[PDB]
Design a binder for this molecule. Sequence first.
Ligand code: HEM
Ligand code: HEM
Lengths: 714, 714
Amino acid sequence: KRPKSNQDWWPSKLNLEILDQNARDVGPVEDDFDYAEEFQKLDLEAVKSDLEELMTSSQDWWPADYGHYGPLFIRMAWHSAGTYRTADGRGGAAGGRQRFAPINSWPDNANLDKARRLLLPIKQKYGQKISWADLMILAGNVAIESMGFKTFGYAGGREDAFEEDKAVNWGPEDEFETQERFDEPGEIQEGLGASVMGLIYVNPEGPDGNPDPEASAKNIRQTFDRMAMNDKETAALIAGGHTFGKVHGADDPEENLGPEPEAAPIEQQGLGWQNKNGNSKGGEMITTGIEGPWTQSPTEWDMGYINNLLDYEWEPEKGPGGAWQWAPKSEELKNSVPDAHDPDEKQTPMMLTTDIALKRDPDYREVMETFQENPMEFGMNFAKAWYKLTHRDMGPPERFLGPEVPDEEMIWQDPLPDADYDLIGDEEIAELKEEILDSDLSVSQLVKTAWASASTYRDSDKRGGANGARLRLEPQKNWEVNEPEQLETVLGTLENIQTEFNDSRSDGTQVSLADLIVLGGNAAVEQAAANAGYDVEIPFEPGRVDAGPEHTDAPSFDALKPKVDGVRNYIQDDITRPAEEVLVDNADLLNLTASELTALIGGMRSIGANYQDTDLGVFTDEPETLTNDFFVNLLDMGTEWEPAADSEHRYKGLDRDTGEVKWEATRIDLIFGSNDRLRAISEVYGSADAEKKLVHDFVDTWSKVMKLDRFDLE
Amino acid sequence: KRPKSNQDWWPSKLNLEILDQNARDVGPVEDDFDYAEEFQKLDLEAVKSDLEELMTSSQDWWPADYGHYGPLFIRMAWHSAGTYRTADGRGGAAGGRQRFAPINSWPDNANLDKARRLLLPIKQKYGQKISWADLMILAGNVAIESMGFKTFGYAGGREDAFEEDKAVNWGPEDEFETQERFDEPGEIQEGLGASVMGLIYVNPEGPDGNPDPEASAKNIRQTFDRMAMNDKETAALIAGGHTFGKVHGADDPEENLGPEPEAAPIEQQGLGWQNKNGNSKGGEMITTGIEGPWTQSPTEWDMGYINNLLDYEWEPEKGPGGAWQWAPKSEELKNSVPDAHDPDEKQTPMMLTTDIALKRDPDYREVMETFQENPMEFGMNFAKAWYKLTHRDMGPPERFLGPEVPDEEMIWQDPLPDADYDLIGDEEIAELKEEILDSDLSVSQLVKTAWASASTYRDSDKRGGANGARLRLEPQKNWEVNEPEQLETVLGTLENIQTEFNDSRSDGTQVSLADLIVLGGNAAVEQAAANAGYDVEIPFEPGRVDAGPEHTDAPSFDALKPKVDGVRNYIQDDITRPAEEVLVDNADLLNLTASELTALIGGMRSIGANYQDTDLGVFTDEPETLTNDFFVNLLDMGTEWEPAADSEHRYKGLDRDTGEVKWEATRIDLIFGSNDRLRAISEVYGSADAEKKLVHDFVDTWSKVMKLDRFDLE
Ligand code: HEM
Ligand code: HEM
């Protein structure tokens, strides 16, 4: 048989495997392989041209609906991106992870295995010059254009992954298609982008299986919100999407379909959901168990969805697949649509409960009425929403590659202004460094501030970072954890230095505040390393610009607000998970390994950049002196730890003999002396001959983070 | 709140996580770090001195029994190495994985956490000069020595790991201290080195908690047997070991012992089994539940154990912990032992069912009585057994470091003779290759033999390999998988070449057959790459020697016989687990990553090197031509797969269109097209631009395997 993981014996075991994924890069791709350069060689048109032909080139193992694969492809692209949550920036189409488990075997993704397979020849024909990730999205764009609708634009740059993202928590559900995340529609558990396990957003039949339109709209609203989309956008996407294709439910899924890809027989070769009677189906295709098309020309762009929905009355019912769907009360629409694979046959259009919801909900109804009224208005709303949906997790404008990239930059891209001046030289740097070090700013003020600036970055959707100095703008400048008043004192001193330096210059040379913040932090760290007798030259990359409120959709940054900050030992008093889990989860967003996280926090405590300047976890007598004191003192058996009475996050380190309190700390600090893998790393650094190693590891990690968002020069 | 791994949703999903461990090296240690080197700097004498000192430096947080930690440390090293199994070479102490879960939290390791803790100060003092793995075994040694007994020797070199070995399969059970592996004592499930999940070998209370000295001996023998130990060794170890220390269990641990390390509070800093009524008590100490010493002088080496067990008779009785144990029927030995912690108290000796199993079982008594007669024979066997027990998973002599390594090289180290001649230069290396390609031996044959010669290497215990050429000796020359008669022929031709080469040498240069075997493969791989238009030169390391049958424990090599071999597509028709699972398991013994495996096999099928020259998986038109034809043809949807009629491992690839039989394959071939992650790699290599990459990735993987045992170069 198979082994048994440690998570099985102890459920609460810290999941450090998410950090290990950051150590190596599974897959056969070279380390020095620059995907950007490869795509830069791709001939996008030839690919789009080939996809054009595929659109109507039906293979027998999965005959095209209406002799056109367009609709199916669209559903595939939309699902590839639709798993995206704003809370952590994970999911999405950035890695093309729909291809790996568990996503590839999600109920909602039924038969998308066949759609991906169809792209296999083209994918092999261009090879590394196009990722599955970029390809699935482009397959949607081409599909949409081929059926008569122009797209706002397209961009390449999405690098394929070679495994699932272990960091993503898809929910508490223990079974697919079931939910334990909401008691009332619109009341889903924090951080989740769906209302049901295995589904992209909501249950197509209605909440909890009930054909309640009004209720459906509440979950549609919340789920989409948690995906960075409003009413206009949601309505446009749902309506523009269902303008094409159909839903397949010839018969009940729970009896006619085989195991999902992951549970399928090896001779299936990655496919799954094999239909008992056959998979080369047409008039018997089953996907979700719901049957029928939405419009009269499922392969053409038009006002078919909106007109069918708004101009006719619909009644709930049980379809041939035994699932909820709606039909018209009139005989006008009956048999007005040709059968997906048959000539001598017509089909009556249908409507999902989630569709009736755009009509029953009063706000979705205004928006929909507007659209029906102005096709041009609905067209662009859909064009722009589609473009945002499929590029939302790619990062700033610098990352979007190719000839079809819109000259216009959207706000959600968190655009950065150009630096219209000359970059400071090696001489100005040392100059400004001393200037800063001469101010009344402590090493802890400079470190804390630079940490607040760069720590907002998250590798999941390439958002945040220290470039742009958004830390001084809303909402970051007012986040509790950034100690607003404290931050203001520091930012003032730096802005003055920026002004003074900018004025005295007589050659167009200027220095951005965003740049000074980080530099002032490298200086503080160097100084802390100097107070311990270590000469270190921290690499500084000048070039960061200062973004303005006009380049910041303030409300969207609230998503990057940390609930826990290891480095500053901050724990919001309401988190559900234990501090350490969030610690690890946040660490993963900064691409840290268990070791890098360990060196960071450890080195930090010796310095003392704590929130509200506490001493929690500061196991040293010489603060602002970079040493391995944290590990040495933490591991001292002479000291014993116990929870602090009437405390929720505080712990006391007592002398096992005298009983006297020696230190105070949190789970963030203690986790490195309890978890077996981490304690093992704390022993290396806590050894008598490793201080220099720690100093250097801490610096490396500190430098890595400061530059995380420096995409332009990667 | 934690990501529900793909493991739960699909309990049968291939576990590629073990191959992922080979892609990266978790832990804060530099790539260019040579432990064996940092070790050479270590003043071993200083370490031993501090170790003997620590032996009588009791810590208030865990008082030293009898005022000496020696016995406890002996157990620590005992359990540290006693988890080794010859079947896969896993377990052991060569990595010191006792520190990591699940091992560190196994019921049989209760309180061993305090034992490893007592060694923290020392480990810290010496840092990278001594690994935890080497320190634990060195502590057991030093523990015995200070108790009047010299050790046969000691060798450092065990590299510290920073995580468990996810590749180890400890058993099918779903709970600790319960077994579902054996009905009758001695009918244990093959592949397992213990009779009960969570134990090192067996249950100290006898099979299923039943004090049946006879049945206990039946398992005591199969366990030690599966751990490379015979009767004499089994008796000496157990007896010599129990000549020290006692068994603790003042009360029932089932109700007086806190959570095990992994499930203990964070304040307990990695420690576990917190005594409910005072952990610093000492007098009140609970570990396994059984209470009492074996000898009247627990801190003195002598015949106390064998004397008490043989000179008197014992009877069953539930001890002060609810566990089965024995005591003297006669009241002569009553209070013959001083109390471990109470200066004003005495205590009566006790024996475990495992200690009575040695008296009852025939072949055991014979040994025990021979020992009692000759105290020296007991010594020579125990000393040598203790040395074999703590070093058998470290590899050949090449890997034994330090100033205390015995000069006499043991048989279990699988010694290799010294080349008594001059190596061959690039000049001769070139000739030899051109000469092997002039023979009538085909690429297939050459490639196949080289693989048979090296594939036996396993990273777990560093055994097997192409150096020594055991392939031509017993038992390997007669392994079904090697095709004896075929192997016979190939070697003959190679030997004739070795001959004609050595005889023509006007100097002292001579070529081993071992080198020639590997030099044949390399040249054959280059030829195959040449027929594909790629000119490649594989790096070759001359210097291997030919081992003789004299210094070869033929029987102990059966554990290296594989039941599956993807390169040659060999599948034993008795393997319980699915072929692909074994394929992965073995690939881990070779330290290959998902990618490497994939390239290896895919490239190999284009060459055609199957067991019995079958056309299984050979999806190519031009064999012995290294290309990416395997991936191109495995991925072609124009082909459909299905299980073969009346065949266990066979699958046929028909033409979706015609229905004509296109290819034939086995799960080993088809897995690369079914598993999500593996398929991701196959698509890379099967692209219209991957061939050259595959050829190079193939050579590098092949070149790697050929050198797995070349420690001498490391
Ligand atoms: C409130 C969120 C929505 C709900 C619950 C939902 C619903 C569903 C259901 C149940 C199906 C049928 C699949 C099948 O049986 O084959 C389908 C697909 C389809 N979806 Fe939607 N979806 C949502 C929206 C979106 C968006 C946001 C768009 C695209 C911008 C779009 C896309 C399409 C197209 C083109 C098809 C038909 C594919 C074909 O004919 O193969 N969907 N959807
Ligand atoms: C069939 C195999 C054996 C069984 C099931 C077994 C049994 C046990 C158990 C139940 C304990 C006591 C744990 C406790 O209460 O603290 C103990 C330990 C002890 N064992 Fe064994 N053992 C085997 C053999 C061996 C071997 C081969 C060695 C090492 C050469 C060894 C040496 C020791 C020592 C020195 C102690 C006492 C530790 C102390 O004072 O704290 N044993 N054993």
